[PDB]
Every structure is written in structure tokens, then in C-alpha cells.
């Protein structure tokens, strides 16, 4: 499970960069899913059903692999249909250079409301502009949200 995380992080993404990632809050510069190759993925990949779910590395057939995404056949099967009868609304992850990627559609970034985002362990790293956000309970499915 844990070694299904893609560790394809660039050298430029060092601990100093990660320290100042959720440290930038004291701010003028703020705001179709398929097969994603694991070579361009740094960190866990999250999809939202609207509840957050981790999608680990697999081969192209969908069989899970456990080699830190180091293999060149490792991908993330993120194909999605709307989650009343499908799997998830969309997904979010950080790529090798440190940019947050999205795909699919938000559950209503992964925004429930125009001001509230689904809360998940990597929210503060993937979306630093939401560090001053407050956490509220949501029942849509019992999950937590982060709002202004």
C-alpha cells in the first residue's frame, strides 16, 4: 500500500522548498481523467468520491505494483465516471516539478462549494493558498471541508 506511492520527485524539490510550502501565508499571487504515467508523479494521488481516496501505482492493466513508481510501466488508472454510479469526480496530485495537477470535475481543485474544499492529508501541500482555511464537518457521505 505505502510503496504504491510514486516517489518521482525532482532534486529541486528539496526539504527547504517543502518547509516554505505551507509557510507562505503572511499572498498577492494566489488564484478528463485517464492513465497518468507514474514517472511524472511526486507524492500520493487523491481522488474524491467526494470523500478522498488514494490511488496507488499499477501497471497498464490495473494490477497494483509496489516499487515506488520507479518502473517505467507504472501508471495511475484515474479513469472516472460521475460518482453516484461511477467512481470519483476527479483527482489531484503533485507532479515531478512541484506543480499541482487536476483532472475530471470538482465534487461541486476539489471544491464542494464555491468556498469549501474537500479536506485531505495533502491539502496544505497541494493547495497552499488555503492554509488560513477553517475546517468544517460536511454530510453529503460524512467528510470534512476546508473553507475561508
Amino acid at each position: 500500500h505505502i510503496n504504491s506511492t510514486a516517489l518521482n520527485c525532482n532534486e529541486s524539490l528539496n526539504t527547504g522548498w517543502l518547509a516554505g510550502l505551507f509557510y507562505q501565508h503572511k499572498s498577492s499571487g494566489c488564484p478528463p481523467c485517464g492513465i497518468v504515467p507514474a514517472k511524472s508523479v511526486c507524492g500520493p494521488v487523491y481522488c474524491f468520491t467526494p470523500s478522498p481516496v488514494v490511488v496507488g501505482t499499477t501497471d497498464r492493466s490495473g494490477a497494483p505494483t509496489y516499487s515506488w513508481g520507479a518502473n517505467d510501466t507504472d501508471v495511475f488508472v484515474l479513469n472516472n465516471t460521475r460518482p453516484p454510479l461511477g467512481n470519483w469526480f476527479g483527482c489531484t496530485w503533485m507532479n515531478s516539478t512541484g506543480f499541482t495537477k487536476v483532472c475530471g470535475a470538482p465534487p461541486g481543485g476539489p471544491w464542494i462549494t464555491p468556498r469549501c474544499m474537500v479536506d485531505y492529508p495533502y491539502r496544505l501541500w497541494h493547495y497552499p493558498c488555503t492554509i488560513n482555511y477553517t475546517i468544517f464537518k460536511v454530510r453529503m457521505h460524512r467528510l470534512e471541508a476546508a473553507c475561508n
Partner: antibody, heavy 119, light 115 residues
Framework: LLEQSGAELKKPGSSVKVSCKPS????????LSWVRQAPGQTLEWMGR????????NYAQKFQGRVTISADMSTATAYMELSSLRSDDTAIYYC??????????????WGQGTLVTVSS | ELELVLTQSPLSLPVTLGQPASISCRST???????????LNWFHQRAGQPPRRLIY???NRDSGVPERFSGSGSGTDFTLKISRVEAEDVGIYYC?????????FGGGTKVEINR
């Protein structure tokens, strides 16, 4: 293609666990549903599990007494139905559906497991 | 959220060998989904065998399914049509919908061949 557990006789109030094994020996990018058919009734969809990611969804009629697990390394999905009533006597199928979700139905089926709930 | 009901007619479809047959499936709610697809499917069950999908998404034929089968319709009316009926086509035909929670199967139509 989808080997299924054998037929079973279970007394009312007990619980029965039915296994579903893909002939690959490994789980891939597909969803696994459980459909049953009681005598004189139409096909009834019970639940859904993605053995790769772990998401499980259950139908409201069975919410509370059905539990669908998946054991990797063994590559065998399970369905457990507790609090067995007399009308749970049915043929239980596991069915493979698309990873992307329900909609297109089920492209592959197990043979079926006949569970007889009787004393 | 309102209960969806699928109705199949007829319930028994006797057809002489070599003649066309059609089975209709009607839904109380439209089956177009958020993604614009219409998720109505068709399944053929033989004696002592699990069901087998013939058509997915109204009209897309499944692999190995004989060309004699075809689906049509939209919204709430759908039709499974067989051009030339063969002895192999005996059994029960179901429709299913995947556009409303939870997924449900039609009542089933029993086709018998008149020889």
C-alpha cells in the same frame, strides 16, 4: 473465468460467506459486484468493491447485513450476508464491471453460488 | 430520490424460427446520465447458466454477440430487436439500467421458439 465458492446450507440467523476468485490470480482495474437471484424474483444488485483501490458501495436493502471484502495476495473477493432470513435463499453471482463505474453492466460472471437458508 | 421501475413487454415472446422478434424495455425516468451517455443494457440467460451481456449503452453490440441482435431507442423507450431468430436464442432476456441508484434489472422476457 470467475471461480465462485461452492453451494451451502445455512440456518436462519447465521451468516454465509461466498468467495469470488479471478482466474488471473491477480486483481486489475475492474469493479466487482455481487448480484443475486431469488426463486421467482428478478436479478437483484447487492454491492460493489474495487479490489484495487478498496472502495465499497452497498444497496440500501442490504445496508447493515452485507459486507464485501477483498483479500489481495490471495486475489479472492468475499461477500458475507449475516442475519439470514428464509427469503435469502438465492443464487449469488459475482460480476465484473468496468473500473469507471456502473452503467455498462457486467461483462463477465461467476457460475453462481446457491445458498439455501433452512433449518 | 424516487423509485425507478423498468417494465418489459411482452413477458412471453413466442416466435417461429427465422422470424424477427423485438423486446421493449420502458423506464419511468430518463436514462441519460450526467456524462451524456444512455446506460441501458441487455443480458440473455440460458438454462442453468449465468446471464450474458448482449448490448451495452442502448445499441453497442458486445463481442461475440451475433449480428442478429441490435438495440435502439432513447430516453425512456428502448427495444432489443433480433433480425432472424435461431434455436440458440431461447432463454430469458433482461434489460438493466446504470443511470439511477441502485442499478436494477427488468422483469425478464421468456422467448420460446415455435418449431
Amino acid at each position: 473465468l470467475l471461480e465462485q465458492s461452492g453451494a451451502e446450507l445455512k440456518k436462519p440467523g447465521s451468516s454465509v460467506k461466498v468467495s469470488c476468485k479471478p482466474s488471473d490470480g491477480t486483481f486489475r482495474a475492474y469493479t466487482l459486484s455481487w448480484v443475486r437471484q431469488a426463486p421467482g424474483q428478478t436479478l437483484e444488485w447487492m454491492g460493489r468493491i474495487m479490489p484495487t483501490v478498496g472502495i465499497t458501495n452497498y444497496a440500501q436493502k442490504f445496508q447493515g447485513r452485507v459486507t464485501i471484502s477483498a483479500d489481495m495476495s490471495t486475489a479472492t473477493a468475499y461477500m458475507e450476508l449475516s442475519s439470514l432470513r428464509s427469503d435469502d435463499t438465492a443464487i449469488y453471482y459475482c460480476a465484473k464491471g468496468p473500473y469507471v463505474g456502473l452503467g455498462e453492466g457486467f461483462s463477465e460472471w461467476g457460475q453462481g453460488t446457491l445458498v439455501t437458508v433452512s433449518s | 430520490e424516487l423509485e425507478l421501475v423498468l417494465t418489459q413487454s411482452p413477458l412471453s415472446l413466442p416466435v417461429t424460427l427465422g422470424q424477427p422478434a423485438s423486446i421493449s424495455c420502458r423506464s419511468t425516468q430518463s436514462l441519460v446520465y450526467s456524462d451524456g451517455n444512455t446506460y441501458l443494457n441487455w443480458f440473455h440467460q440460458r438454462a442453468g447458466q449465468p446471464p450474458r451481456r448482449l448490448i451495452y449503452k442502448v445499441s453497442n453490440r458486445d463481442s461475440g454477440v451475433p449480428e442478429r441482435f441490435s438495440g435502439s431507442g432513447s430516453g425512456t423507450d428502448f427495444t432489443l430487436k433480433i433480425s432472424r431468430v435461431e434455436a440458440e436464442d431461447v432463454g430469458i432476456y433482461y434489460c438493466m439500467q446504470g443511470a439511477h441508484w441502485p442499478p436494477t434489472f427488468g422483469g425478464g422476457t421468456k422467448v420460446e421458439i415455435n418449431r
